[PDB]
Design a protein around this ligand. Structure first.
Ligand SMILES: O=C(O)CCC(=O)C(=O)O
Ligand SMILES: [Fe+3]
Length: 294
């Protein structure tokens, strides 16, 4: 079931255990959790930010209270920081209400505001997010940790955000497995020494980047693989492990996004993670820092 719909309409909603179970089982199975009625309202003073000219996308780090990617007057940067900080706070609260099993293992990461219309985008194949992919960032290895994202469509003209959702990760990995290759010896160490990567690119991160890139260049797979097109309405929110769920965006404007990280050993079913699926498929440990279980 690629998309599981929920009725919650508040960021402070209290959930029954049954809904919590549905959410964590769905999330870990690679479903998108969809909240059609969960809107993220803006203050009147923030409405001015609903304009693409503010990008010079925009990112905020809640851990350091630092805003990047935008220039302007102090008071405007304060207002924009306040908007993204509120999105970080509300998404973090919501995830702790919905996923108590993860406890304090949820680690917030960067907040993103995306005011540029998607349908006019055109770039190199590897960063073309109209192509189905799982998330893997060449400059930012994960060391196996999960990439969990919360998304909210805040389009004020009532325009949906058009996604496509692909086949399960295990089928994607199987399709691309004959195209995977090990890294060149010493190359990842040089990327680390040279500051091209933030941290060391694990073998896991190498293979996730290969899946991401080779999947995007596989034009027959992009055209023919199983996929469902879904429009997320304005005023809706959705939650997804974007390292596991194949996704692409086709159209839309004005998105808030919050990234969280989660260690694999905090998952209810760690064997369903991309890390463990890749380690099983290649019969090897793919992250050197891995904790060892006696
Ligand atoms: O902009 C979007 O709606 C999706 C982009 C994407 O692939 C992502 O945030 O991981
Ligand atoms: Fe993505």
């Amino acid at each position: 079931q690629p998309i599981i719909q929920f009725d919650a309409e508040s960021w402070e909603a209290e959930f029954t255990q049954e809904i919590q179970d549905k959410a964590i089982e769905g999330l870990e199975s690679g479903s998108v959790l969809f909240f059609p009625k969960l809107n993220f309202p803006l203050l009147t003073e923030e409405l001015k930010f609903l304009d693409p000219t503010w990008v010079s996308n925009i990112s905020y780090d809640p851990r350091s209270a630092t805003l990047k990617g935008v220039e302007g007057k102090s008071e405007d940067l304060r207002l924009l920081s306040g908007l993204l900080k509120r999105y970080a706070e509300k998404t973090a609260a919501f995830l702790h209400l919905l996923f108590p099993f993860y406890g304090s293992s949820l680690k917030i990461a960067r907040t993103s505001f995306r005011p540029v219309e998607i349908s006019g985008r055109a770039t190199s194949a590897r960063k073309d997010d109209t192509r189905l992919h799982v998330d893997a960032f060449p400059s930012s290895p994960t060391g196996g940790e999960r990439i969990l994202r919360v998304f909210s469509n805040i389009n004020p003209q009532g325009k949906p955000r058009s996604w496509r959702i692909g086949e399960p990760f295990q089928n994607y990995l199987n399709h691309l497995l004959p195209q995977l290759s090990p890294p060149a010896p010493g190359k990842r160490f040089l990327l680390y020494l040279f500051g091209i990567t933030k941290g060391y690119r694990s073998l896991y991160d190498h293979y996730m980047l290969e899946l991401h890139d080779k999947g995007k260049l596989d034009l027959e797979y992009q055209k023919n693989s199983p996929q469902v097109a879904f429009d997320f309405p304005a005023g809706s929110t959705w939650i997804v492990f974007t390292d596991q769920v194949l996704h692409a965006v086709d159209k839309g404007q004005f998105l808030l996004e919050q990234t969280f990280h989660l260690k694999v050993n905090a998952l209810k079913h760690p064997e369903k993670s991309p890390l463990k699926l890749l380690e099983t498929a290649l019969n090897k440990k793919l992250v050197s820092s891995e904790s060892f279980k006696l």
